[PDB]
Amino acid sequence: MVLYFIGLGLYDERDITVKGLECAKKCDYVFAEFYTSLMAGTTLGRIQKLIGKEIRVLSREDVELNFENIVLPLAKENDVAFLTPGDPLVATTHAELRIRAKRAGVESYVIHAPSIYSAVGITGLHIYKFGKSATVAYPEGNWFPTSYYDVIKENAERGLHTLLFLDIKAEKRMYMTANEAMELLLKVEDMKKGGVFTDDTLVVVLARAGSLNPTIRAGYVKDLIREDFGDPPHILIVPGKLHIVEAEYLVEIAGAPREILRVNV
Amino acid sequence: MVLYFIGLGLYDERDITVKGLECAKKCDYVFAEFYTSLMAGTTLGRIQKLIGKEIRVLSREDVELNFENIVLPLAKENDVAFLTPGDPLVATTHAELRIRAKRAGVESYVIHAPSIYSAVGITGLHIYKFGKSATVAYPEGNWFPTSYYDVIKENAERGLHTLLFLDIKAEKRMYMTANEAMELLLKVEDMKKGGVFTDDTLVVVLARAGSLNPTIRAGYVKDLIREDFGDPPHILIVPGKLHIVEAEYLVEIAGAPREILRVNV
Numbered sequence A, B: 001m002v003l004y005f006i007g008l009g010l011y012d013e014r015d016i017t018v019k020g021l022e023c024a025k026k027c028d029y030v031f032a033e034f035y036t037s038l039m040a041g042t043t044l045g046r047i048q049k050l051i052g053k054e055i056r057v058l059s060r061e062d063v064e065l066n067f068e069n070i071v072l073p074l075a076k077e078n079d080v081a082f083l084t085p086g087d088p089l090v091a092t093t094h095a096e097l098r099i100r101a102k103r104a105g106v107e108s109y110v111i112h113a114p115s116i117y118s119a120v121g122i123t124g125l126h127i128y129k130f131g132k133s134a135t136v137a138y139p140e141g142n143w144f145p146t147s148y149y150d151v152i153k154e155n156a157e158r159g160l161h162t163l164l165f166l167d168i169k170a171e172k173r174m175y176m177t178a179n180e181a182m183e184l185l186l187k188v189e190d191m192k193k194g195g196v197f198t199d200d201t202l203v204v205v206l207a208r209a210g211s212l213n214p215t216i217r218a219g220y221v222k223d224l225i226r227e228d229f230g231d232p233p234h235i236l237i238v239p240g241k242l243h244i245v246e247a248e249y250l251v252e253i254a255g256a257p258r259e260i261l262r263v264n265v
């Protein structure tokens, strides 16, 4: 009679919370999805070993089209868990699944876990200063999307930071690198000429948040565009004007050039 | 030889990640602060029991003025941990403590935990649609904070949602309720008269995120301003322009007036 939305966390199998783990262990059935994102620091086998139960993986179609035929039926007579990377309901379409549960007469509860939305706090950038967020999508065929560029523009214009999610082909396990994102943004700049993203733009790259050894780098595009930030996933951020405290953290902790203390503050 | 920043999560001691628990267990000394947020579902005893270590609680002054005199000295010959509610680097000034550690020759590591910043996803509002965040602070003497009002105005103008952290005076055991935040906002409105926050403004209240049955309510200020949302902590959200799916969730899950289903595209 109960469906539990449980977040897996940032990186590996130990990023789930104690509450989430214990709940997963008490559920009769455990489902998971890895189409919204992957857990780069672990494997399905390791998550299964930790939970001590077989995990049935669901595709985007299984969830988006048949959630009520695959998961909800069992949730009527058993305790069922639905695992998702990060924090449940952060993924735009998952909240509606709670409505489907209601329509089916199934109770649902949410057990949270860390999300990159809050984890970016490790970059030293003040969380309250983040504005609208966006996703950098790969252009394809005759389609060249650029709305993420406009989001950066509107945020920076108001002195806010922009959290940029990078494209991912979950099914094919293919990540867009921060390097590719920067190249794309420069191309968009050459197109729109808005003076929004250039070789002189200060950016922050966060790789493998959740790991005990994440990569946190800050610097100008001209210098970071060919830098190796390690294995994915990569998150790109375009800070607005910095608080001196933010700049000092980027210099001391993220290896940013001292120059930011006078140019970007 | 190192210092661990470990978040304890939203509500109770089990909101800590497995990673945070295992790392905390292997530390020689454990410190913590409980003034940046309120963990309404646990106590120091339960936390100590779970981690199996005695925990030394620090005041805002112990941290802000003497972190390097109380905590860092021990991290030079032992592994030390510093626990905080939610995520240690979200809506706190704790990030600067990493600079203090560095200058003291102490390497530090961060272990995330669920944060209210991402937990807002449970309201059904698209997390990427949130703009600049702000804090509703208690007036003090002749000083009456009002900047949070302008934040709402700026976000709303852009169709973005506004997350409002509410004030807290831990030493006085004072936790601002969404009701008190609404009252203050109405007073600021009478002054600035920007039509930003009125009896007709749609708001969303999230109380005790992290618990199994948090209070999630949406409606007009005139109707919610005197509603009982249960024990603290509470956060208040002023949505911008709603997507239909956001409105549907607010109505179905947060008991919002069915009339908000009719969006003015």
Ligand SMILES: Nc1ncnc2c1ncn2[C@@H]1O[C@H](CSCC[C@H](N)C(=O)O)[C@@H](O)[C@H]1O
Residues within 6 Å of the ligand: A118, B010, B011, B036, B037, B038, B085, B086, B087, B088, B089, B090, B091, B092, B114, B115, B116, B117, B164, B165, B166, B167, B168, B206, B207, B208, B209, B210, B233, B234, B235, B236
């Ligand atoms: N479980 C919870 N439910 C509702 N609001 C919460 C909350 N935890 C924190 N808050 C809100 O955030 C304020 C503390 S701000 C510190 C937040 C913390 N670092 C985190 O990551 O969550 C509180 O005064 C309250 O308004």
Ligand code: NA
Residues within 6 Å of the ligand: A117, A130, A131, A132, A133, B127, B128, B130, B131
């Ligand atoms: Na945000």
